[PDB]
């Protein structure tokens, strides 16, 4: 790749830079190369990994709805619309496949850990669930599955091997909450969920100290929000 | 559309 | 270009959208193939052309100053903040010389009507400005005469074919007070200029109607908050 | 750095 002549150390620092810069496009484009050095990446380093592409996607996401939404109502002016949504979709279908090509070669095979391994998976069913929001073909079901089986797995490894309130375990079901509810169109699914984690997590907080507090009572808020919502 | 919470940067 | 099979009027309407999803780089990828066709711009395909690279230099401005302010704190860690700052210094002026570019491939040249000429001009004075921001080097004086004398020309077609109160002319003038300011390190001339920007618009607000009363007054408030912040 | 106010979109 691009990266290759970098050292990884000067790729991770420049991902550094580049998140303190707003420069979303470049922090993923060296974690990428960061990841293609073959060696495992560290708490930090998976973070790195992941805020940088969440903050690529996140604006094609949203890009995407918005002409997805001008081109429902052009259907109730030419092709330029299709078009126009259609590049933009391509674009993030490809941003989508790139980084669940990082998890398949090699990330998630070379995760032992469960901090690692869930983390992992969590990224492969979120990357899918991008896919699911945008798929329509033959596909469709396919794609659903892909985000469901990869989310499973880490929800079990998850309760085997995390305490309630791990803020990797919280948000993996937060976000599969969210599959259940609106992709795999499973609302009472995603309402237990939520609920049974946050009484769970509540029940796990006296062991905590004031910083792991904080961390896991954002994310049940975040499962309180949805709720909120929801019910 | 009405996006809820998900983990991380909220990037959309 | 990568836009030459798609039609002029396809563009607009696609740098129209992309304006609506925030894709600033497609939105001026899509201008700049418009402005290659050929024909002269109207107001509003001006409008978009400018919109479109002040969202994209912009975004490289706001990165470039983040990581000058973190290479300049480090020389009070290796090569690789200069290396960054560098990188995105690099793009930016890749994005003034595109804009450049296309002003002098041929916008300017075409343009007779004072409203697209001053308009164009200012636009000449801006890139040149953005590029003396990062310049250091002993081009670094005929950028900033380069800017200035895109910004005289626009000033004195404006002065005599524009009424004060016009948008064009006052986004010029309140440029233009920045640049001496900061650029041309000369503050009581960005004082002075802006006051009597200010001052003359005021006087021509009773010949305006409603809607161009808003449009006038909008810019000279923001002359009004340069000045505040200078004296 | 203090930016001053410019025409146009505040997009740095
Ligand atoms: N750059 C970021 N947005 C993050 C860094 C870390 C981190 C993890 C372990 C050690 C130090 C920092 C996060 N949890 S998010
Ligand atoms: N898309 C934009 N951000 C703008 C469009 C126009 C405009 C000019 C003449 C006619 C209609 C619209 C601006 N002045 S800004
Ligand atoms: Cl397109
Ligand atoms: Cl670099
Ligand atoms: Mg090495
Ligand atoms: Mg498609
Ligand atoms: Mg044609
Ligand atoms: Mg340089």
């Not at chain 1, 599955?145 to 305490?163: F, G, L, T």
Request: aromatic fraction near 8%; charged fraction near 30%; glycine fraction near 6%.
């Amino acid at each position: 790749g691009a990266m290759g002549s970098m050292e990884r150390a000067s790729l991770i620092q420049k991902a550094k830079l580049a998140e303190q810069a707003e420069r979303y496009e470049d922090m993923a484009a060296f974690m990428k190369g960061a990841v293609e050095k073959g060696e495992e990446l560290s708490c930090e380093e998976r973070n790195l990994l992941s805020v940088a592409y969440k903050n690529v996607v996140g604006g094609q996401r949203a890009a995407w709805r918005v002409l997805s939404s001008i081109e429902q109502k052009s259907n109730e002016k030419g092709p330029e619309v299709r078009e126009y949504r259609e590049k933009v979709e391509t674009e993030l279908q490809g941003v989508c496949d790139t980084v669940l090509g990082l998890l398949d070669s090699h990330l998630i095979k070379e995760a032992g850990d469960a901090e690692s391994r869930v983390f992992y998976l969590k990224m492969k069913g979120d990357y899918y669930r991008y896919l699911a929001e945008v798929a329509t073909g033959d596909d469709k079901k396919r794609i659903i599955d892909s985000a469901r089986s990869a989310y499973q797995e880490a929800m079990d490894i998850s309760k085997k091997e995390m305490p309630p309130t791990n803020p990797i375990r919280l948000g993996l079901a937060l976000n599969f909450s969210v599959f259940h509810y609106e992709i795999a169109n499973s609302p009472e699914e995603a309402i237990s969920l939520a609920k049974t984690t946050f009484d769970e997590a509540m029940a796990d907080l006296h062991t905590l100290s004031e910083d792991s507090y904080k961390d896991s009572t954002l994310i049940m808020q975040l499962l309180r929000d949805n709720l909120t919502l929801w019910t | 559309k009405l996006m809820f919470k998900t983990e991380g940067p909220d990037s959309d």
